[PDB]
Amino acid sequence: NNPAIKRIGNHITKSPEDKREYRGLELANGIKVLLISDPTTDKSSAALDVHIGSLSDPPNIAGLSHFLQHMLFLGTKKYPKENEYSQFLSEHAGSSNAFTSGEHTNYYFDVSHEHLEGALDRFAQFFLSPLFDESAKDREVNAVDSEHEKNVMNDAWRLFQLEKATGNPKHPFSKFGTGNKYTLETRPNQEGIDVRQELLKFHSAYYSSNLMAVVVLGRESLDDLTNLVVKLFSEVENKNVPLPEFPEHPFQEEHLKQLYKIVPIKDIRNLYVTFPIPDLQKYYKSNPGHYLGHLIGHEGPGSLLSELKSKGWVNTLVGGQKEGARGFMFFIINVDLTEEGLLHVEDIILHMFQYIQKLRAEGPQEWVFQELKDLNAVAFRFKDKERPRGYTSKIAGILHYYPLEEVLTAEYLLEEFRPDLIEMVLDKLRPENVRVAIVSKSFEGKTDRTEEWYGTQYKQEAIPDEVIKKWQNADLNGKFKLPTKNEFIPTNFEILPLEKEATPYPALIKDTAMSKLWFKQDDKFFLPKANLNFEFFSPFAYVDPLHSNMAYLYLELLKDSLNEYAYAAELAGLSYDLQNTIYGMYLSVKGYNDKQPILLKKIIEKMATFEIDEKRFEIIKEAYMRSLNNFRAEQPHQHAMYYLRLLMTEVAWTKDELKEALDDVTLPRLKAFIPQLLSRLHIEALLHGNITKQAALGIMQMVEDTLIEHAHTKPLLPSQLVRYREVQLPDRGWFVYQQRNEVHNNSGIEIYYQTDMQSTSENMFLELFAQIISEPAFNTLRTKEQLGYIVFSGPRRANGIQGLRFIIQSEKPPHYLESRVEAFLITMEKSIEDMTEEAFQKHIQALAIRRLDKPKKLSAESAKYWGEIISQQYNFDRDNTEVAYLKTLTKEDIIKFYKEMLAVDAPRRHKVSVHVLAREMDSNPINLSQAPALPQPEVIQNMTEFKRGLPLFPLVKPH
Amino acid sequence: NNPAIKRIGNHITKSPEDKREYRGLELANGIKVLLISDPTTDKSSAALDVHIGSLSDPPNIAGLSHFLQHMLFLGTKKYPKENEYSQFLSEHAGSSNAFTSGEHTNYYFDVSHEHLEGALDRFAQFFLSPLFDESAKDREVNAVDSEHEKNVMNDAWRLFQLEKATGNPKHPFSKFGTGNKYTLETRPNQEGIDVRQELLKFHSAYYSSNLMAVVVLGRESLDDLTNLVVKLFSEVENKNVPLPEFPEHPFQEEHLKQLYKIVPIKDIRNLYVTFPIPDLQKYYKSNPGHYLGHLIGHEGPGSLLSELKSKGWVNTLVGGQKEGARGFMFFIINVDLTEEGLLHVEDIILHMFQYIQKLRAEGPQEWVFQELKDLNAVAFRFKDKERPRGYTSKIAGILHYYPLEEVLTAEYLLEEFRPDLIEMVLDKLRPENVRVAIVSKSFEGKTDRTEEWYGTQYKQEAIPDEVIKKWQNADLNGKFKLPTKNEFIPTNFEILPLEKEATPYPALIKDTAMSKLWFKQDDKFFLPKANLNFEFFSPFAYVDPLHSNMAYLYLELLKDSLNEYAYAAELAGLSYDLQNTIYGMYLSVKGYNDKQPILLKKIIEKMATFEIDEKRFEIIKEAYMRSLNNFRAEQPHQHAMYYLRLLMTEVAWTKDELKEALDDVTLPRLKAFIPQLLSRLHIEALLHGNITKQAALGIMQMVEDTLIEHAHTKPLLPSQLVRYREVQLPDRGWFVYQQRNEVHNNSGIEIYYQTDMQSTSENMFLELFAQIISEPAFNTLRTKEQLGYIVFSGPRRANGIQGLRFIIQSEKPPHYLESRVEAFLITMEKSIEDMTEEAFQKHIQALAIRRLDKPKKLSAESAKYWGEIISQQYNFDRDNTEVAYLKTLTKEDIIKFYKEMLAVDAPRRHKVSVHVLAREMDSNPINLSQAPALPQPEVIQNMTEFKRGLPLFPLVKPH
Ligand SMILES: Cc1cccc(-c2ccc([C@@H]3[C@@H](CO)N4CCCCN(S(=O)(=O)c5nccn5C)C[C@@H]34)cc2)c1C
Ligand SMILES: Cc1cccc(-c2ccc([C@@H]3[C@@H](CO)N4CCCCN(S(=O)(=O)c5nccn5C)C[C@@H]34)cc2)c1C
């Protein structure tokens, strides 16, 4: 009855708690489409996936597909303005991005629900008539080269591409994917290639409709959505491109029984064991790869990790199948290495095969599969409502692998118990099929090979046959028992009835000298889940560097102890987060409310009654010091962000200060620290979810009663609950802090324009101005000036203060970017004066939409409340209140704000800049916009003297 | 603060290339004010708009609002001299006028920038205490009666007023607006009404301050202007008149599905299709009327016109929204009709609804709106600087509809794309809502109705139900495709830097036997625009009537061929004008310089490689013959000018001479004409704008190279470049040429006093004398003696000669008008001898101001240079040279000039008169001034014998 629709899918099985409406289609051109109607969503979204990726790149232009991704945004035949896509979405509360794997290219966006069509039309044109403007091609390649440069000194990227290079060099697996300036301009222009043809030749050849999948999520009806999708996409051309598949495995015989010794950039000690396996993707109903990954990577009692941990060799273990293109997969076992573990790699790998041998002798266990089936079934029934942008993007990728009807469930539910497949995969996990990778700084200078793309230093050795035989004849270790029935599986999913005296916002149901309990029973989602957030205040968690380290070590030791017990809970959708802060400790417990109080008690009991294993202490204390040193290898812009945090906070310890005081942390002092830390506390907590007021009060008092009994905890005085303040910069001032990054050869910079204390007025002034420049700053500093890959502009909130911040990571010196971002600021002044009165109210409505986006899941709503709480501001109706004021603003109110607080010659300009110089960058001192003349900056020489000479801002009045 | 200012507008968004400064005000009495400060302007200006017009006229005094317009100029209480307003502006390089629509009355003036205050004071008095002197009222009604009489025999006015009468007769839309002697004197004096009371009753009632808008433009600062404006206008009285609005549409049910067959005065064939629609004025941000008007009235490939054109039915199509008062609008589609098109009106209108149905099935196209929004955005950024008199009047009108800040942009920029509104208007365009009007002489005698005001003959028919159903069931025509992306949108707006060897005046950078290229790089405006003027000389373009006709047909056919191609360019701010002259062809290309060489090449290529469509040839050749016959229905004063042009030019072909020889133009002869016309040419060209010297040489060489390749063009001999001379009249001579106008019952006359060849001395003598008599000639012959509505006096320049000319259109016989202008000339003889030495030097400053007015936009500056070029005079510094001499003139030097060249008994009087008698005027032979005695005139019997018996003036020496 319609010629543009090949077929229509039947009922799409969804979670019975899912209110949304779904319809499956296959267009005439073979485009698999899923339509999602959610009349509640404040933002609509859509995404398209092409079953092509890096592996189909031409041999001579590595990275073309990932480059073509960048180039689809920069102009279409119908919408040729270079940034009409970015500009349209920014003005309509939208965002967008895209990624490129080996077999997929995935484009997605979201936007205000009233402009889905306007966005979709502009978005759809990507696959019909893209410009590939020569002017934009020569510019955007720098964004790709900067993107790669960031990754060049990253240990995870260097290993990623190392595995590719280490296998069969003829296999597309070895292809370089990211692409850089060499492979995309220098060498092609060196081989005479016109890249714009190779972009059009590729786009026209592979971007066929038969290899595309589309997901559209909007308020519109399912029928309205169907006509919209058919209207815009039925004109995509079908080329009947055969789906590429790679049956030959990238790792052949000569690539097996090999050992690699790799020099890392950070200070880490890791061991990777890999086995090639066939494409298990088609067995999704039985999922044998995850059955084995569950048992191998198990962290519970009697597990493989437990013994490697007990022997003081490893600390973490990760196992399971690793994805590869159609026709080949891998099986990885990842362990970090202690100092001793590095010397016993032979035994570690043996212990691995001893556990595998155990799994072979016991055979497939139906009860395990039944457990995994039941757990997934629950997780899917009570699946949290996904964000539209992430939801549409994920489904668009999996429409290629599963029938229309199962698309929602295919990745969750299990059906077939296939013990034959388990034994089949378990037989490929053998020493004659193994590949071993060791990463340790100890191989410095002992390497003889280099990886051409990232520079990785490594050495390749064949695994001695003598060692293989030891692994093959793997005796059974009596320390490896199969896991037992998970006792944390939830059984009570009953949604408690909504109390009469219930509230819409969290209520303060307890305000004692020791506790302060915020409570709200969930009235929006009705899932058997709850979030339990606790802030423990103790002035002894950050009083000096020595105590900060012990605060960290105290918890890292505590969590290490509970891992065996708690791992079962984690599997049962019941997790806990525990870590130190600058004000004390933070404990979060989210998941199914059934077994929740049982886990929380075991945590608080273990807190107050903790006994330290000396062997574990010395191992974590070491790993912690490497984690501090390894900060020198972070991105230059993260250095800038780190340093600025140090400069503007009243009290704050540098990594160097902590690292020095860490040697003085003897176990005696740590054993004495804990009881000192727990002796006086104040507890501010948020209990939010499927639980009643009375149960919530019981939770809080249980944490109190446990601490009082076993730690003899007393309350704090209200005068002790002092929050740290932010430094008050002087009017017309400009400070510059200069440091270097010894690792990365990129430069970084953060620029902080300090406004004033947070307030309903000063908040919206900033948030609106940052909305108007959000997009143009990206188009000017990256798309045009191509300063780098990382260009961020937005508000900075901290310690009750705020301001505008720019963050750039580039190849240029920072003092250049200073002028360029300063020159851009004057570009905005005009752009505002010329901005129409209507285009202005557009931005206001854009900010108001993003500010009033309703939280989709319980976890997200809790954050809003938890943010108002830790901030001591307690403004739970901030969104309605602040949006109301925002709409009353005029274009003139913004101009006076810029002229008064921000402009280069403003009277109240508060500017502080952080310059992070590239590794080899010498000590710093046309068709572009004019940069203003800048005053002489005051150069911070010492951070402590800097703060002593400046006032401190007050603290925000609460409520 | 200030109490006389209700509020002050913030930054008024302006074009970012606009140097002027703007401030918005709302006075206490509700007068919306815009202040324009332009310290560059040579002329200051101001204008006031009243939101009242013809529609608010009393039912018994049709035209009162348009009558009150004429009456405010004739005296004020503070300035009671009847012409103190007209006189003041004339003595200070000023001008003024005003018009009256259905909802507005708009007064405006300009004046020397040093006298804005003096003029504004006199101007403001219009709305405070006007005289309405009874003596002037009885006189000015003739000025209104003559204005209507002019329009009585005009086809556009007769249709205008016909539609009004054809709708609801109770609706103010049906009101007579222009007013004549009947509605303002004869009928009122018969019903006892005192018109002078109704003028004050109306003025006092409707001329309220709350319905006024004021714009003042001057060199003064925005504050000084603000003080001036408030001083003079804050004393206007606020009556709180409610703004009239007309929600009832003039066309109700009984007025729809009607057809009208109308007899025109000219021989024309037109078809008007109208649909009543609601007042779309409020949806101005999205403007759905222009989206549909854009697509319907589109002339590109696949458009409605192309198929109606291809079927040989129409030649032009016009579409869009037609303005009506608040609460109702119209939608018109205007197509001319070929001979065959006249017989296929049913099918033509069907083809109309077939196209509309196409627009409904494809629905609104957002990419189209984005093209219009981006195109308008460009045009506004690079907006040419407007003349003060026109700018203030246009802005004064739109201050009533938009906020103070948006006034400048409201009518240019678009923002919201509202497909819901587009579907709303597209639904009002349906056959059951249509009104059809056919205009053709073929309905002569077959009409049964007459329009009471203009006498229009028409017949009213109901559209048969059978025809309506056919139109409704409009199949989709495969010949109607949506327009495609406009490829002429400019992308390179780069302002080229000013070359070192640049000049202030056009330089002659090429002087060959074939070309002579004048060049100037724009050094004043710096917009991405350029003007390309070309004069092609061929002696075969005017050798005889047959060749003159083929010159016209050649270009009119060529433009017809290019229209489909060039229409896109027109939209992209890139237009071209092409037409024949008495020396050859003239091709002009103005607009954005980016895509300019692409269009110029396609024109010159099409010139030399032109192939004639036989069907189009016969259609234009017919339409061209009607255009010649239809000249008999032009204004009598236009006949007088036409005849005088024939008498005084060496060679000149009459309409009758061409029209008879037009039958002999067979297509073969035209095909042979073109290559002969192109075989030998001389090209004199002016390239001026945003372009370099070498780019200019590149432009010319392409025009040359293209002509040589495809037309084998050879140069002309210098002796072939013969210009036409003007007849040398004998001293003390007087000739009279008498003809009739068969259409209009008014008489016309031009009087030419020939002085001598143009020269810096003889030029300024005339230009000054015409300045002194400029105003008094209007005040004496119209304001006092009320000879008619059209009374013009000024210099006449032609073929290197000059002289003084009077032009009057009256009801009186011409030979009477002859004496009156002679009687006025003696009035001036006295007025000069008695004129003060101060009043004399005032006129000198008046002429000097107007001569030295700097051009505001590029198009205007090119004209000044282009005039010097075609005139073979090449005096680019004429204004400074002539004004310098002008100041050295004395009152005595003028008197001797009059006694010698102009006076009735001067020794060198050279007088020639043209008498055009009204249709029914018999063959022509108090308190007023004494008319002098005139000699016996020599009566021109044949124009050729006239020229044969007289010498010919030389030609002006250049440089
Ligand atoms: C020379 C050689 C021999 C044998 C194996 C390897 C090898 C293979 C893959 C990796 C990937 C690389 C990014 O692709 N890394 C990031 C750090 C650890 C996280 N994970 S993961 O834990 O392995 C992993 N992801 C999915 C499942 N699981 C278990 C990815 C690992 C690293 C090293 C090499 C390089
Ligand atoms: C009895 C009857 C029924 C239906 C319609 C009409 C009717 C109404 C108005 C007109 C006017 C007439 C003089 O006012 N013309 C000028 C030539 C064609 C141009 N246009 S225009 O398209 O609106 C138009 N020019 C410029 C922009 N735009 C939108 C007006 C048309 C002509 C005919 C009548 C008289």
Q: What is the 3-state secondary structure (H, E, C) of A616-640?
A: HHHHHHHHHHHHHHHHHHCCHHHHH
- CA B324, B330, B336, B339 dihedral sign is negative
Helix (H) or strand (E) holding A779: none
CA-based R_g, chain B, Å:
29
Q: Is the distance from CB of B151 to CB of B144 less than 8 angstroms? A: no
Strands B747-757 and B910-917: antiparallel
Q: Which CATH architecture has domain A500-726?
A: 2-Layer Sandwich (3.30)
Helix (H) or strand (E) holding A585: strand A584-592
In the sheet that holds B910-917, the strands lie side by side as: B790-798, B801-810, B747-757, B910-917, B733-740, B938-939
Contacts of A114 in chain B (CB under 8 A): none
Contacts of A78 in chain B (CB under 8 A): 367, 370, 485
Q: How far apart are CA A78 and CA A71, in angstroms?
A: 15
Helix (H) or strand (E) holding A213: strand A212-218
Cα A352 versus chain centre, distance: 30
Q: How far apart are CA A147 and CA A551, in angstroms?
A: 37
B399 lines ligand 2 (CB under 6 A): no
Q: Is the distance from CB of B87 to CB of B779 less than 8 angstroms? A: yes
Q: How many CB atoms lie within 10 A of CB B48?
A: 26
Q: How far apart are CA B600 and CA B591, in angstroms?
A: 12
Q: Which residue type is seen at B324? A: G
What are B527's two structure tokens?
């917009």
Q: Is the distance from CB of B346 to CB of B354 less than 8 angstroms? A: no
Q: Is the distance from CB of A519 to CB of A509 less than 8 angstroms? A: yes
Q: Is the distance from CB of B451 to CB of B158 less than 8 angstroms? A: yes
Sequence-ordered list of residues with C-beta below 8 angstroms from that of B302, at least 6 positions apart, any chain: B479, B480, B481, B482, B483
Q: Is the distance from CB of A475 to CB of A358 less than 8 angstroms? A: no
Burial B710-736 (b: 16+ CB within 10 A, else e): bbebeebeeeeeeebbbbbbeeeebbb
Q: Is the distance from CB of B119 to CB of B715 less than 8 angstroms? A: no
Comparing C-alpha atoms, which of A297, A292, A291, A302 is closest to residue A483? A302
Q: Where are the alpha helices (DSSP H) in B52-172?
A: 64-72, 84-90, 116-124, 134-152, 155-166
**Rounded to 5°, angle at Cα B334 from B332 and B338:** 155
Q: Which residue type is seen at B98? A: A
User: Is 3.30.830.10 the CATH number for A1-243?
Assistant: yes
E strands in B549-699 = 574-580, 584-592, 682-689
Q: With both helix axes pointing from N to C terminus, report the angle between A878-887 and A837-851 in degrees, rounded to the nearest 10.
A: 180
Q: Is the distance from CB of B13 to CB of B406 less than 8 angstroms? A: yes
Comparing C-alpha atoms, which of B325, B278, B284, B327 is closest to residue B429? B278
Comparing C-alpha atoms, which of A835, A819, A833, A829 is closest to residue A928? A819
- Tell the residue nearest (CA) to atom 10 of ligand 2: B160
Residues in chain B: 959
CB proximity A118 to B under 8 Å: yes
Q: How many CB atoms lie within 10 A of CB B295?
A: 24
Q: How many CB atoms lie within 10 A of CB A830?
A: 11
Q: How far apart are CA A655 and CA B605, in angstroms?
A: 75
E strands in B5-71 = 5-8, 21-27, 32-37, 43-50
Q: Is the distance from CB of B116 to CB of B44 less than 8 angstroms? A: yes
Q: How far apart are CA A668 and CA A671, in angstroms?
A: 5
Q: How far apart are CA A405 and CA A509, in angstroms?
A: 47
What are A522's two structure tokens?
């969930």
Q: How far apart are CA B939 and CA B946, in angstroms?
A: 10
Sequence-ordered list of residues with C-beta below 8 angstroms from that of B427, at least 6 positions apart, any chain: none
Task: Give the SS3 label for residue B73.
Answer: coil
Comparing C-alpha atoms, which of B588, B955, B627 is closest to residue B799? B955
Q: How far apart are CA B844 and CA B765, in angstroms?
A: 11
Distances (CA, A) of A686 to A708, A867, B313: 20, 11, 79
Task: To the nearest 10°, report the CA torsion of B710, B711, B715, B717.
Answer: 180
Give B53 to chain A, closest Cα distance, Å: 30
Comparing C-alpha atoms, which of A855, A5, A116, A24 is closest to residue A408? A24
Q: Which residue type is seen at A729? A: L
Q: How many CB atoms lie within 10 A of CB A859?
A: 17
What are A597's two structure tokens?
């109080």
Q: How far apart are CA B373 and CA A296, in angstroms?
A: 62
Contacts of B416 in chain A (CB under 8 A): 838
Q: How far apart are CA B759 and CA B771, in angstroms?
A: 18
Q: How far apart are CA A154 and CA A634, in angstroms?
A: 9
Q: How far apart are CA A882 and CA A870, in angstroms?
A: 19
Sequence-ordered list of residues with C-beta below 8 angstroms from that of B256, at least 6 positions apart, any chain: B276, B432, B433, B434, B435
Comparing C-alpha atoms, which of B271, B563, B277, B214 is closest to residue B442? B271
Comparing C-alpha atoms, which of B63, B229, B285 is closest to residue B161? B63
Q: Which atom of ligand 2 is nearest to the CA of B321?
A: 29
What are B789's two structure tokens?
């509505």
What are A299's two structure tokens?
């962290």
According to DSSP, the residues that pair with A276 across neighbouring strands are A330
Facing residue for B10 by CB, picked from A79, A830, A890? A890
Q: How far apart are CA A188 and CA A181, in angstroms?
A: 10
Comparing C-alpha atoms, which of B788, B780, B798, B806 is closest to residue B870? B798
Comparing C-alpha atoms, which of A849, A928, A786, A813 is closest to residue A44? A849
> Are A837 and B374 in contact (CB < 8 Å)?
no
As a three-state string, the secondary structure of B384-452 is CCCCHHHHHHHHHHHCCCCCCCCCCCCCCCCCCCCHHHHHHHHHHCCHHHCEEEEEEHHHCCCCCEECC
What are B456's two structure tokens?
């229009």
Helix (H) or strand (E) holding B766: helix B760-778
Q: Which residue type is seen at B949? A: G
E strands in A654-718 = 682-689
CA-based R_g, chain A, Å:
29
Residues with CB under 6 A from ligand 1: A 156, 159-160, 162-163, 166, 260, 272, 274, 318-320, 322, 332, 334, 435, 437
Q: Is the distance from CB of B469 to CB of B348 less than 8 angstroms? A: no
The DSSP call for residue A899 is I
Strands B938-939 and B733-740: parallel
Q: Is the distance from CB of A599 to CB of A576 less than 8 angstroms? A: yes
B160 lines ligand 2 (CB under 6 A): yes
Q: Is the distance from CB of A679 to CB of A543 less than 8 angstroms? A: no
Asked how this structure was determined, the answer is X-ray
- CA A307, A313, A318, A319 dihedral sign is negative
Sequence-ordered list of residues with C-beta below 8 angstroms from that of B594, at least 6 positions apart, any chain: B490, B491, B492, B493, B528
What is the resolution in angstroms? 3.6
Q: Where are the alpha helices (DSSP H) in A835-902?
A: 837-851, 858-870, 878-887, 891-897
Helix (H) or strand (E) holding B825: helix B814-834
CB proximity A835 to B under 8 Å: yes
Helix (H) or strand (E) holding B175: none
Burial B138-157 (b: 16+ CB within 10 A, else e): ebbbbbbbbbbbbbbbbbeb
Backbone angles phi, psi at B793, to 5 degrees: -135, 135
Task: Give the SS3 label for residue B632.
Answer: helix
According to DSSP, the residues that pair with B5 across neighbouring strands are B27
Comparing C-alpha atoms, which of A37, A40, A18, A42 is closest to residue A527? A18
Q: Tell me if B500-726 shares its fold with B727-959.
A: yes
Q: With both helix axes pointing from N to C terminus, report the angle between B345-362 and B288-296 in degrees, rounded to the nearest 10.
A: 130
Task: To the nearest 10°, report the CA torsion of A605, A611, A616, A618.
Answer: 130
Comparing C-alpha atoms, which of B302, B271, B273, B860 is closest to residue B567? B302
Q: Is the distance from CB of B911 to CB of B752 less than 8 angstroms? A: yes
Helix (H) or strand (E) holding B168: none
According to DSSP, the residues that pair with B912 across neighbouring strands are B735, B752
- Kindly tell me the burial class for residue A488, based on how many C-beta atoms sit within 10 Å of its own C-beta (0-12, 13-18, 19 or more): buried
Strands A21-27 and A32-37: antiparallel
What are B148's two structure tokens?
């209507």
User: Is 3.30.1020.10 the CATH number for B244-473?
Assistant: no
Q: How far apart are CA A838 and CA A844, in angstroms?
A: 10
Q: Is the distance from CB of A354 to CB of A471 less than 8 angstroms? A: no
Q: Is the distance from CB of A351 to CB of A476 less than 8 angstroms? A: no
The DSSP call for residue B256 is S
Q: Is the distance from CB of B206 to CB of B56 less than 8 angstroms? A: yes
Q: How far apart are CA B671 and CA B76, in angstroms?
A: 65
The DSSP call for residue A54 is G
Q: Is the distance from CB of A313 to CB of A406 less than 8 angstroms? A: no
What are A778's two structure tokens?
């990206």
Domain chopping of chain A, boundaries: 1-243, 244-473, 500-726, 727-959
According to DSSP, the residues that pair with A435 across neighbouring strands are A258, A274
Q: How far apart are CA A613 and CA B639, in angstroms?
A: 116
Four-way CATH pick for A727-959: 3.30.565.10, 3.30.830.10, 1.10.340.30, 1.10.12.10: 3.30.830.10
What are B454's two structure tokens?
């203009």
Comparing C-alpha atoms, which of A285, A241, A248 is closest to residue A171? A248
- CA B277, B283, B288, B294 dihedral sign is positive
> Which among A54, A157, A159 is the best mutation to test ligand 1's pocket, defined by most ligand atoms within 8 Å of the CB?
A159
Residues in chain A: 959
> Are B485 and A78 in contact (CB < 8 Å)?
yes
Question: In this complex, how many residue pairs, one in chain A and one in chain B, have their CB atoms less than 8 Å apart?
Answer: 47
Sequence-ordered list of residues with C-beta below 8 angstroms from that of B905, at least 6 positions apart, any chain: none
Strands B258-262 and B435-440: parallel
What are B595's two structure tokens?
């895509």
Distances (CA, A) of B551 to B321, B561, B679: 36, 16, 14
> Maximum Cα–Cα distance for chain A, whole Å?
81
Q: Is the distance from CB of B809 to CB of B145 less than 8 angstroms? A: no
What is the number of alpha carbons within 13 Å of residue A456 lying toward its C-beta? 26
Q: Which residue type is seen at A201? A: K
Comparing C-alpha atoms, which of B53, B495, B461, B556 is closest to residue B261? B461
Q: With both helix axes pointing from N to C terminus, report the angle between A222-233 and A116-124 in degrees, rounded to the nearest 10.
A: 30
Q: Where are the alpha helices (DSSP H) in B529-592?
A: 545-571
Sequence-ordered list of residues with C-beta below 8 angstroms from that of A515, at least 6 positions apart, any chain: A682, A683, A684, A685, A700, A701, A703, A704
In the sheet that holds A910-917, the strands lie side by side as: A790-798, A801-810, A747-754, A910-917, A733-740, A938-940
Q: Is the distance from CB of A523 to CB of A499 less than 8 angstroms? A: no
> Maximum Cα–Cα distance for chain B, whole Å?
81
Q: How far apart are CA B256 and CA B276, in angstroms?
A: 9
First to last CA, chain A: 61
Q: How far apart are CA A209 and CA B205, in angstroms?
A: 70
- CA A808, A813, A818, A824 dihedral sign is negative
Cα B396 versus chain centre, distance: 20
Contacts of B415 in chain A (CB under 8 A): 836, 838-839, 842
